[PDB]
Amino acid sequence: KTVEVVKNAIETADGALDLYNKYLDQVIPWQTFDETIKE
Amino acid sequence: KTVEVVKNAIETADGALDLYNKYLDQVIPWQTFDETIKE
Amino acid sequence: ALDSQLTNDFSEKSSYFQSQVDKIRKEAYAGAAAGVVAGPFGLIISYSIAA
């Protein structure tokens, strides 16, 4: 039960990215931009 | 069990956005506006 | 026919353009604006990232 900190942190960092992008996308509408380009 | 605060908060922040938009949409009917434009 | 339509259809995309770039602002600033939760210095970061 010493390494479990790293593990728990690893998973913390994962969901970090997730929220990061999730917001980054809301912030930078590349979806909307790209889509708009295609059509 | 020190980093778990960040993790828990990360997830708190996630559902924050969610409710945020969820309401923001109820508030700004872009769905209805866009739809209305298309038809 | 082609000309007739391509003319009408072109003005329809030119309308879709601005109506769409709008969607882009509305999506991005509703996003930066969302920085009110974390500090106003967060807005500088957020809004710079966005606008």
CA atoms of C28 and C23, how far apart (whole Å) = 9
Q: How was this structure determined?
A: X-ray
B-contacting residues in C 9-48 (Cβ below 8 Å): 19, 23, 26, 30, 34, 37
Q: What is the rounded CA–CA span in Å between residue C32 and residue B38?
A: 27
> With contact defined as beta carbons under 8 Å apart, do A24 and C50 qualify?
no
Cα–Cα distance for residue pair A28/A21, rounded to 1 Å = 10
Which residue type sits at C18?
A: Q
Contact residues on chain B for A18, CB-CB shorter than 8 A: 14
- State the Cα–Cα distance between residues A33 and B25, nearest whole angstrom: 20
Sign of CA dihedral A32, C51, B28, C43: positive
CA gyration radius, chain A: 16
Chains that touch A (3 or more CB pairs under 8 A): B, C
CB neighbours (10 Å) of residue A23? 19
